[PDB]
Structures are given as C-alpha cells and as structure tokens.
Design a binder for these strands. Structure first.
Ligand SMILES: [Cl-]
Ligand SMILES: [Cl-]
Ligand SMILES: [Cl-]
Ligand SMILES: [Cl-]
Ligand SMILES: [Mn+2]
Ligand SMILES: [Mn+2]
Ligand SMILES: [Mn+2]
Ligand SMILES: [Mn+2]
Ligand SMILES: [Mn+2]
Ligand SMILES: [Mn+2]
Ligand SMILES: [Mn+2]
Ligand SMILES: [Mn+2]
Ligand SMILES: [Mn+2]
Ligand SMILES: [Mn+2]
Ligand SMILES: [Mn+2]
Ligand SMILES: [Mn+2]
Ligand SMILES: [Mn+2]
Lengths: 105, 90, 96, 77, 92, 108, 99, 86
DNA sequence: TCAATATCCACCTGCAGATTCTACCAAAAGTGTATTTGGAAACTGCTCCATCAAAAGGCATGTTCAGCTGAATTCAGCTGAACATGCCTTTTGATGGAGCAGTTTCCAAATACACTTTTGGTAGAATCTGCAGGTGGATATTGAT
DNA sequence: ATCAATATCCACCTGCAGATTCTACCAAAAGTGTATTTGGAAACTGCTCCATCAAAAGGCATGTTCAGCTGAATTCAGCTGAACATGCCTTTTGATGGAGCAGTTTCCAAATACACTTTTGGTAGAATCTGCAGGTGGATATTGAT
C-alpha cells in the first residue's frame, strides 16, 4: 500500500487535490502530474506562512499560533503581503504603524 | 465536511515541532489553502481554454503559478512543484 | 491635578488599538443595523451568528483601512485632523 | 439604528487606522459610508441565500458576497 | 479558417434601436469584446452558484441569480425581465 | 422532420441561442446545462447590447453623426451611472474621456 | 504694441478642453513601439509582435496614465494646490493599492 | 538582418506627450519633477503587463506576442480592455 | 534638565476551557485491468511580421522671460481633546419551541449524445456612402487700453 | 466702457477608404430517437435561531475646561507656462524576404472507464495543558515648574 503523497514526498493530499480538480469544472481532463504539482505548491506556501507565524508566536511567548501571528507574519513579508493584498484575516488586526508627523517634537 | 486541517498541522509540526495553532488560525489557514487552490486552478483552466487544450497538466499549473505568485515565491513554488512531480514520477 | 496634553492620550489609544484585534463596534447595535438593512432586501430573514460576525469583521476591517487612507489624505493636506473631505477623496480614488 | 454605531466606536476604529485627531463631522460621514458598505454586501449575500432556497443567511453567503466584491475574508469557511 | 463573432446580432439589434444608424468596425470590435466579457462574468458566476449548491446543472435560475449579483439595480431588473420573458415564451 | 425553427426565433430573440448553448457546454461551467439557461443568457446579452447601442446612438446623433464610433460608446457608458458601474474596470480603446474641468482650475 | 501674450493657464485650459474632446493617442507610435519591444526583449529574446498587440498596450497604457492624472489632480487640489507634484502621484497610487 | 539595440527608450516618452496625457486627465499645471516620475510609473506598468503577456506567449509555445496575450494579461491584472478581440 | 505622576510591560499563579488525542466507520482513495483518445511530431502552405527606404512636415527641443504659484510665516478664533459624573444600553445567562435545514424514495420530466438533414453564418466580391479634411466666414473670448 | 489680437464654432463641399450589402458554400444547429440523470413532492426528525424574561456591569452620553490646530491673511522668490526658431525624427507608403503561425495526418503515451477492496479523514467525547484573568513591581514616558 502506498499513497501518491508519500511518493511525491508531500504532506498535502495528492488524491484529494486531483479529485477536486476533476470535479471543479476546470477542464474535461486532468493530467497525472497536475495534482502533485499543485499539492506541492500549496504545501510550500503553507510552510512559509507557518514558518513566519510560528516565529511570531514564539516572539509572543506563546506555543499556539493565533490569527494575529498570521497577520503579523503575512504583512511583514513583502511577497506574502502582495499575494494576499486583497485578503482580510479575521481577528488579525493591523501592523502597529504611526505616521511620523503625528509624533511629538 | 472536509478541510486541510490535518495536512496544515503536519506541515506545522515539520517547521515548528513544539508549536500549536488555535482553531480560528486553522480556519484562516483553510481559507488560505482553498483560495490559492481556486486562483491557480482557475488560471490553469483559462490557460487550457485559450490554447484549445482539454487537459490541465503540470505545465498549466506551473504557468499559472508564474502568473499568480510574486518573485521569489514563484521561483520556489515552481521548484517545489517540479521537484515533487519528478520524485512522484521516479 | 494631572492632565495629559491634547494628543498624548490619542496616541496612546492608537498604540493600544493597533496592538489588539478585538472587535471595536458593540455587537447588538451592529446586529440590529444588519437585520434592518437586510429587511429592505428580503423579508423574514434569519441570520447565523457566524454570518453576523463575518459581516462585522469585514465592516470593521474596511472602516479601519478607509481611516488609514483618510489619514493619509489629511496628512497630505498638511493636517493632523481627518475631515469628511479626506474620506471623500479616499473613496473617490478607491473607485467607491 | 445607524446611531447605534456610536462615536467612541468610530473613534476606536480610527485609532486602529492610526488617526490622531478627528473632526466632529466625521462620525455621521462614517455612518453613511458604513451603511453603504453593508447595503452592498448584505444585498449580494441575501441573493445567495435566496438562490439556495433558504431563509437563513449563512456565513458562507457573506463570504461569497465579500469575495465577489473583491473583499475576500479568511476565517469563516 | 472561419471566425465566429457576435457582429451580425449586434447589427440586428442596432437596426432595431436606431434604424438609420451604422457602426464602425472598431466600435463593433468593442461590442464583441463587451458581449464576450459579460458572457464570461455571468457564466462564471452561475458555475460557482451551481457548485456552491452541489448542483451539476446550470439552469436559467443560476443565470438569473448571476445576473442579479453582477448587474446594478434597474439594469438587473430589466435584464431579468427580458430573460424571464424569453424563457417563458421559448418553453411555450 | 418538420420545417426547422430556431431556438432564437422561438425565444423571440436576435442573439443566437444555439451558439450560446454550445459555448456554455464547451466552456466547462457545469456538467449539464438546462434548456432555458442559454435562452435566458442570450436574452440578457441582447438586452445589454441594446441599452448600450441605444445610448451610443443617441450620442452619435448628438454629434451630427450617423455612424457609432468608440467615442460614442464611451460617452454612452460614462454618462450612464449603472453602465459606468458595470464597466468600472473596463477600458474602451479610442474612447477618450468625459470633458471635465475642476472648478477651482477655472479663472477667478 | 507689444505682441500678444496669453496669461499662464489660459493655453493650459485650452489644451485641457482640446484633448478631453478628442480620442487620439497622445504618445508617439514609434517610440512607444521601441519601449515595448525593449522591455519585452528583457523577458524573452527574439520576440515578435502583432501590430494590434502593441496598439493594445498603448491604448491600455494611455488610459491608465490619464486616469492616474485625474486622481493626481484631485490630490493636488486637495492640498490647495493647482500644480501636480510627485507627492500627488504617490498618494494616488498608494490609495489605489498600487504601492 | 537584425535591428539596432533598443536602449533608453523610456525617454522617448517626451515631456510634451506626458503634458498631453495630463491635459486629458484635466491637469492645468505641472511640476518639473513630474515627467521623470511618470516615466517610472509607466515603466513599471508596462513591465507588469508585458511580463504576463510574454508568459502567455511562452505557454502557447509561440514567438509572437498576440493582441489576445496582451488582453489576457490586462484582464488578469484587472485592466480589462475592449476592442482587440478581433 | 528635574520631582512628581500615570501608564506600560513582564512576570506570576490558579484553572477554566480550548486544544490535542482517540477510536469508530462511511466515504474517498487506491488498485487491477481494460479501452480510448488528446495532442505532439511532422511536413507545409502562406500570412503577416521585421527592417529598411525616401521625403515631407509635424512636432520635440532649447531658449527667453515674467506672471503667478507654492512655500514660508504670523496670529487667534473656536474646535476637538481630556476628564469627571451618572444614567442606560449592552452583555451575559436561561428557557421554550417552532420554524428551517437536511434526508430517503421514487418516478415523471429533463438532459445527454449520436445520427441524419437543413440553413443560418461566414468570407470574400461587389456596391454604397459618411465623413475626413479642406476652405472660409461668423462668433466668442482674451488682455491690454 | 472698448479695440486688436487669436481661437473657436459652424456649414458647406467632395472623393475614397471604410462600411454595408450581395452571393453561395458549408459548418454547425436542428430534428429525431434512445439512454441516463435528476428534480422535488410527500414525510419525517434533530436542531438551530428567534422570542421573551432578567440582572448587572461597564460603556457611553453629557457637561466643563482649555490647549493648540486649522484657516485666513501676507509676503516674496523662483518655477513653470507661453511663445518662437531650428531641425530632427516621426509618420506615411511601399518593397523585400522569411520567420513562424496554422492547417492536416498519424499514432501512441497518457488519460478515462469500471468493479471492488483498502485506507483515511471527520466526528465527538476524553485527556491534556495553555492562555488568561488580575495583581505586582519595575521600566518608560509624560507634565509643569524652573
Ligand atoms: Cl500532468
Ligand atoms: Cl470637510
Ligand atoms: Cl433551464
Ligand atoms: Cl513632490
Ligand atoms: Mn535589453
Ligand atoms: Mn471501440
Ligand atoms: Mn484524436
Ligand atoms: Mn498660493
Ligand atoms: Mn488661545
Ligand atoms: Mn439561407
Ligand atoms: Mn471635419
Ligand atoms: Mn463538411
Ligand atoms: Mn471498460
Ligand atoms: Mn482489486
Ligand atoms: Mn486516520
Ligand atoms: Mn502557561
Ligand atoms: Mn492582564
């Protein structure tokens, strides 16, 4: 017995991704490599975000990542920020940022 | 109802073995994964249609990734995809 | 007896609320407003609590971002005080 | 009911938006804006709700409406 | 190498609304662009609608809902009238 | 096998129901497509086309012109609030812009 | 008689009316063509172009710049100025979510 | 057999051309620093569209950028363009 | 620079409660075969594309110079911030029940395809025609008298 | 309370490049007939939400005081617009040659199709441990008087 994800060296479900592609009304047919590739990409992005968010969680002396940590992680990363420029993260709040002119002296 | 929760958790344990995640944050990760899935699959679908191809392959996925992802994220994601396909194929 | 100068407490509040993530509008009035507006589109509607919550997160995120842009407009006009004029400029440039 | 969105709430929102000083005329203005926003989302949301032949607006209806306004929301799926 | 387009139908409509008016080739190109655009918007939204509700069939109801989501106000109401009337007549 | 009658003729439309149906079928939108869907869609597309051509024709006559050009389409769309909303993110090639000078810029 | 001379602004206003009335492309064709081919050459070499492709690029670019200048103008006027400055462009593009 | 190297063509977008564009945009008065600024902005814009366009061209295994490639790039950048689908 | 305050910020501990762990079981995924088929390779017919050429005039560039704009400054009216009081709205916690979602079964009705004809849509060819420019005279507007 | 000095409209005119109509073949609808799905109408049921009641806490509305910000008024020095001469280079039209799209045929590597059996992920309580609710005290900042 072997899963496709095991073979591809992935954690994300290749079979599921493949099935979602087939039933997603995207194309009449779906190639064997497409769900492997897609699953790999999704896993990679997830890994990057969890990496940074985990860093923020450790910085806040917490063992559990919360939405705030995800917001901090995403917005303080230029490319992740562009990728998610039109996305609202519930309970994420905003980056602390005060316009210099508003400060005293 | 299905979700990516267990896979997100596995990845989390890979990159931070002693770190957990709140329920809300997991919900946000699920939203994220579904969102990017739709962006990439949608773009790949359009790519296939424009070129009168009835099959979405890893090549459409790759091109779609290059269109949707910025800079370094695109390069690394492309690397991971190709690498995974190569390993799976082996 | 003590008195912080105008601006100090404002700034302190900015740091406080930018540090946190809690919803800033009271639940019940928002609920009331949402159900009221919704009645004008379709009648005898009900709402999941999560639906109302989604609406509130979205609304507050939107308003906060708008206030950021508004602030930028005011500062652009060499002011520290946001005015309806600033909001209107921001919304016009947004294509709202 | 629009008056239920009080002055200090709007001040809190502005503070989160980094605003240091606020004109008195802002609040009513803000309310108008808020109203419009809600009217736009809820409308679409309810549309989805009625397409599903339901009477209960779900979180997903809202999410789809926001998504279609390009106001994508994470966390309510 | 035959190419299809909405040109003749756009022209028929034009002759309906302005019997003594013509149209440049470029303006016709813009009209074709328009029709294809709105087609993709409506069909796409209807596809999503069908998927959200676990339905395998796009019907006139999906099309109608999509029209209501995509078009503003009176444009939407009028479009809905045209669509509904066309379907009711067609079935009969 | 009777005398053929087109779906567009039955629906009372100018726009091609059959073509629209085919495009729905091969556009990968859904596994199945109802009979009324392409009729409805064709009707809507036709209607929108009619509204825009109406306004653009009016604009063309306002310029003492008998042929609609892209400029007329722009005038029609931008001077109409709802069409402007519908096409808010659309560029009309060779359309130019609406004449509009900010009052403060005028001589004082 | 000193020769004729319009006051600063009059000819500017005249030009505004003129170009808002017309629809012709305002950038010279050949130099735009060169710019496009140069930039494209930096992504992929020995590319060719349909003439309509370049035309599409120019229509899009000019519509974009014109709209940008509208917003920029509003930003300048907001600050009680009549003269658009780089600050105005930067504000407009920031609020647009371009930066 | 091959054309002269394309160099510094962004300067081909002259001061009076930019002035004309601004006029259509309703601008009455223009700071001297605007033109260079504009050149930067346009440059970025083009880079973003053309990039995607070329991507489409490369996906189709073509060596010729078509109007449709451009149209698709503009569309995915939320810059929908009418009039070149023909 | 300074006493005299007020407010953050880190750190602490007791536990309520979110999160992680477990184990059951439909429902997906996997699997073993068996058949099809999309599209890539491989000519190849011809569009368009790239580049150059001449010439003519439209437009870019540099120059001069002064009007008027933007920037810098001054000042005080009155607006908006901060703070103290006390009322009431919202928050929080229950209870009851009906009004929606969500589900199964089963056939009538709706759709899917393939086969077989027909006809509306297309590509040039043959015709038709605005309108682009070209000319010129009234009307409007502008800046200095 | 006007004249010059320009720019802008407004009508008229006609040839031709662009639009429209005409022709006739044929791709793609339409008609027809079987094969498959599916829409819901009837009939149940656990639950979500709504309606109503209730206490109480903290958040808001209000009144007072005043600091300081916004807007008006003023002043000036350069910058940016207007105008003009030069001559470059864009535009226009066409030639020349071929790179590179498309069109057609051919045939397998890759994908779909079934019939069943494993494997897995969703679910809801148990078990496990982490934030958090407040409280302390030390760091950090602020304020007004010098
Ligand atoms: Cl593949
Ligand atoms: Cl105002
Ligand atoms: Cl239907
Ligand atoms: Cl500047
Ligand atoms: Mn280069
Ligand atoms: Mn066979
Ligand atoms: Mn084949
Ligand atoms: Mn000034
Ligand atoms: Mn004072
Ligand atoms: Mn016929
Ligand atoms: Mn003319
Ligand atoms: Mn045939
Ligand atoms: Mn079989
Ligand atoms: Mn088996
Ligand atoms: Mn398992
Ligand atoms: Mn702890
Ligand atoms: Mn605490």
């Amino acid at each position: 017995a072997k899963t496709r994800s095991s073979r591809a060296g992935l954690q994300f479900p290749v079979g599921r991704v493949h099935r979602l592609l087939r039933k997603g009304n995207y194309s009449e047919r779906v190639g064997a490599g497409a769900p492997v590739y897609l699953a790999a990409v999704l896993e990679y992005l997830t890994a990057e975000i969890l990496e940074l968010a985990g860093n923020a969680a450790r910085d806040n002396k917490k063992t559990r990542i919360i939405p705030r940590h995800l917001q901090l992680a995403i917005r303080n990363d230029e490319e992740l920020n562009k990728l998610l420029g039109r996305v609202t993260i519930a309970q994420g709040g905003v980056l602390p940022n005060i316009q210099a002119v508003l400060l005293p002296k | 109802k299905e979700s990516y929760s267990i896979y997100v958790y596995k990845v989390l344990k890979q990159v931070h073995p002693d770190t957990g995640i709140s329920s809300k944050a997991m919900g946000i990760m699920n939203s994220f994964v579904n969102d990017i899935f739709e962006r990439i699959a949608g773009e790949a679908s359009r790519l296939a249609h424009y070129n009168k191809r009835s099959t979405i392959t890893s090549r459409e996925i790759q091109t779609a990734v290059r269109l949707l992802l910025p800079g370094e994220l695109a390069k690394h994601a492309v690397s991971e995809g190709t690498k995974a396909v190569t390993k799976y194929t082996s | 007896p003590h008195r912080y100068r105008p601006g100090t407490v404002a700034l302190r509040e900015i740091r406080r609320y930018q540090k946190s993530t809690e919803l800033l509008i009271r639940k019940l009035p928002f609920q009331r407003l949402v159900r009221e507006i919704a009645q004008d589109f379709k009648t005898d509607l009900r709402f999941q609590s999560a639906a109302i919550g989604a609406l509130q997160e979205a609304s507050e995120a939107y308003l906060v971002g708008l206030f950021e842009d508004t602030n930028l407009c005011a500062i652009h006009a060499k002011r520290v005080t946001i005015m309806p004029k600033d909001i209107q400029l921001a919304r016009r440039i947004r294509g709202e | 009911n629009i008056q239920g969105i009080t002055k200090p709430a709007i001040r809190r929102l502005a503070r989160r938006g980094g605003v240091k000083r606020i004109s008195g005329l802002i609040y009513e203005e803000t309310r108008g804006v808020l109203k419009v926003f809600l009217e736009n989302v809820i409308r679409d949301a309810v549309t989805y709700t009625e397409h599903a032949k339901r009477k209960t607006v779900t979180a997903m209806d809202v999410v789809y409406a926001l998504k279609r306004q390009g106001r994508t929301l994470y966390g309510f799926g």
